[PDB]
């Protein structure tokens, strides 16, 4: 039955990734006064299927100068970690109920960083190398900021368990409690997922597709799937962490509906931001977190250490 549960977690996530591709296309079109895909099927519903079939029936090539061993591993690692990030999320019952349900997320994200690095380096191309180093810098910045922000927010919670996050947010919302950390965390999630205005590793205007310049057909589709799965997963993480839904043990479907609605709202906000804003410059992104977010993040961490102690509201350990 556990294998059935794993499949039920995996396959709908990939379906949601494909239809998120479609939704982003249409949302950007209507924000840009276009229509978006509406020809392939009824309201363009078959467009993701057409694109997937085309990509997996098209020829993939390996560059002559490429290191083939790490050329193949990078999409495998990216997709595997994108799917693995979904196992501890409670909706409202996690597939795997990890006691430290957040450090696993941090470690797997840091490991998923290396997929783009190894794809860029293995490609043996200058644009891929530039994209890889942009990934290095972006990872530095968002890693330190994410670590401190998450520490503070979970310090308001009591432990590193997401079901405990639900129980904490039973009455009110962490967005109400700690909205500055929430805004900085949203920016950090944008940077982590490489979405605009921080799409530096794959900046089309400055680089020709960045790290995946040499990737075509199936391997490229795996990078796209991993990116969109990470987008949805991080939006779900933000929704669980800051927008806590009410949970009824006897009818847990209501929590699932609320969680999915919040996740969709955050993902549509991601697409909205991409449509609205220009692109950063990676040195300006590094100076944005270190020189603006990091000082305020340290101050807010001190404040959120002191607040439960000074108000006699330290959360229960269990």
């Amino acid at each position: 039955m556990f294998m059935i549960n794993i499949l039920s977690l995996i396959i709908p996530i990939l379906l949601a990734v494909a239809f998120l591709t479609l939704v982003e296309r249409k949302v950007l079109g209507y924000m840009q006064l276009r229509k978006g895909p509406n020809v392939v099927g009824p309201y363009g519903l078959l467009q993701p299927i057409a694109d997937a079939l085309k990509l997996f029936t098209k020829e993939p090539l390996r560059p002559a100068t490429s290191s083939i061993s790490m050329f193949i591993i990078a999409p495998i690692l990216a997709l595997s970690l994108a799917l693995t990030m979904w196992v501890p999320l409670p909706m409202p019952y996690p597939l795997i109920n990890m006691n430290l349900g957040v450090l696993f997320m941090l470690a797997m994200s840091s490991l998923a960083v290396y997929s783009i690095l190894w794809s860029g380096w293995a490609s043996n191309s200058k644009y891929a190398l530039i994209g890889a180093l942009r990934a290095v810098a972006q990872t530095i910045s968002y890693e330190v900021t994410l670590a401190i922000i998450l520490l503070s927010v979970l310090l308001m919670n009591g432990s590193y368990t997401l079901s405990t996050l639900i129980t904490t947010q039973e009455h009110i919302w962490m967005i109400f409690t700690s909205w500055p950390l929430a805004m900085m965390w949203f920016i950090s999630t944008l940077a982590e997922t490489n979405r605009a205005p921080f799409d530096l590793t794959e900046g089309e205007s400055e680089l020709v597709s960045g790290f995946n310049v040499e990737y075509a057909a199936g391997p490229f589709a795996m990078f796209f799937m991993a990116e969109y799965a990470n987008i949805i997963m991080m939006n779900a993480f933000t929704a669980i962490l800051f927008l806590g839904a009410s949970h009824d043990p006897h009818t847990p479907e209501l929590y699932t509906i609320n969680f999915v609605l919040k996740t969709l709202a955050l993902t549509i906000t991601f697409l909205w931001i991409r449509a609205s804003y220009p692109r950063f410059r990676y040195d300006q992104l590094m100076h944005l977190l270190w020189k603006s977010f990091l000082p305020l993040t340290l101050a807010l961490c001190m404040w959120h250490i002191s607040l439960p102690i000074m108000t006699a509201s330290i959360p229960p350990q269990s």
Binding site: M3, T65, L77, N124, K126, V144, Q317
Partner: protein, 115 residues
């Protein structure tokens, strides 16, 4: 057990997708098809040559600050102790030292990229 099973499942699915991608479609590869891409012209040098890293100092500071976050992570359990005064004093000591390190680097221009 379950975590190993799901890791195996994800890796197997990704590997199967790679196998399908590299064996289903028709392949016709020649020398120019697989050549490196440099916007239509041949590359002047090699991509394996040294590539200057203008933020080398910031990477080392990132290493040290990663240590700092490693130290700061067990705070949620440290708030359950009876010695709340000592715990708060030492936590604020660590955070103040981290802030002082950031301030020193910023004022000595360690955060400015090399020209």
């Amino acid at each position: 057990m379950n975590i190993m099973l799901t890791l195996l499942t994800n890796v197997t699915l990704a590997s199967l997708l790679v196998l399908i991608a590299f064996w289903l479609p028709q392949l016709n590869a020649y020398s120019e098809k697989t050549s490196p891409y440099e916007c239509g012209f041949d590359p002047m040098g090699s991509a394996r040559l040294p590539f200057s890293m203008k933020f080398f100092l910031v990477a080392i500071t990132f290493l040290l600050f990663d240590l700092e976050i490693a130290l700061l992570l067990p705070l949620p359990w440290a708030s359950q102790t009876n010695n709340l005064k000592t715990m708060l004093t030492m936590a604020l000591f660590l955070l103040i030292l981290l802030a002082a390190s950031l301030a020193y680097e910023w004022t000595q221009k360690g955060l400015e990229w090399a020209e």
